[PDB]
Amino acid sequence: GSGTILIDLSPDDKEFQSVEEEMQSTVREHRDGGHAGGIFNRYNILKIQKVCNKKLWERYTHRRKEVSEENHNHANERMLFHGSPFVNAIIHKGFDERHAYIGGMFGAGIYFAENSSKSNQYVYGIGGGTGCPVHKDRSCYICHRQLLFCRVTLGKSFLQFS
Amino acid sequence: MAHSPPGHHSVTGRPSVNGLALAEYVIYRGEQAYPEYLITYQIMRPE
Ligand SMILES: CC(C)(C)c1ccc(-c2nc3c(NC(=O)[C@H](O)CO)cccc3c(=O)[nH]2)cc1
Ligand SMILES: [Zn+2]
Questions:
Q1: Where in chain A are the domains?
Q2: Residue A17, SS3?
Q3: SS3 for B24?
Q4: Which residues are within 8 A (CB) of A108 and not within 5 positions of it... i.e. 6 or more apart?
């Protein structure tokens, strides 16, 4: 009883298909040769579910309006990927400081990617951790993985070259 | 949790060397993201 329901989408749904497309078309090679997240060019999409939670949605839209009004009515809202071992907390409790990376490059915040394959590197933790629970294989082709595709308010974003 | 740079709401990490890489972003308030879709998948072995 968290308030969260997961609505399963059909593969025939226009909305399943555009989310899958964004997932598949933003795969790239990584400078570690696949070390953290595995060696692949594409995914097998198995399921896509919508995350519905009225409280967490209102919490998001309330902050969006704050940011918007501090930035000439421009939330600068994107759809971005998030991979984390805490995806199950996140979908039930929402994002908070337990999902931030204290040791991150750009500070102690919550990190999102335009490249799905980048988020794929944190599904099993920092650096890919030890890989999947069952095989300890960061390149497991067997075990199922989960990513979030999230709605993110960037507001006035500080540009950092790197 | 850190704070955003003053007068900012997030940080864009621009890809600098990697020609093919897209941007990465950071927010410092969890209220600035909502998890809309949960995607279950497998990576696929290249043939
Ligand atoms: C510490 C725990 C809670 C385990 C964690 C850490 C990182 C990520 C995570 N990190 C990302 C990221 N992070 C970095 O580029 C460097 O870690 C910053 O130094 C870039 C792009 C996307 C992601 C992303 O989807 N998830 C999730 C959870
Ligand atoms: Zn496995």
A1: 7-153
A2: helix
A3: strand
A4: A97, A100, A101, A102, B1, B2, B28
| CATH of the domain spanning A7-153 | 3.90.228.10
Is the sign of the CA dihedral B1, A160, A27, A7 positive or negative?
positive
CA distance A9 to A123: 22
Look up tokens 């990617």; give the residue. A113
Sorted by where each starts, the structural domains of chain B and their CATH numbers stand as 1-47 (6.20.320.10)
Cα(A19)–Cα(A90) distance, integer angstroms: 19
Q: Which of A109, A114, A150 minimises the CB distance to B23?
A: A114
Nominal resolution (angstroms): 2.1
Strands A77-82 and A43-52: unpaired
Nearest-atom number in ligand 1 for the CA of A104 is 19
List, as one string, the DSSP characters of A98-131. Answer: GGSBTT-TT-SBEEEESSHHHHGGGTTSGGGTT-
Asked if A45 and B39 count as a contact pair (C-beta separation under 8 A), the reply is: yes
3-class state of residue B16 by DSSP? coil
Q: Is the CB of A124 under 6 A from ligand 1?
A: no
Q: Which two tokens stand for residue A147?
A: 């990513």
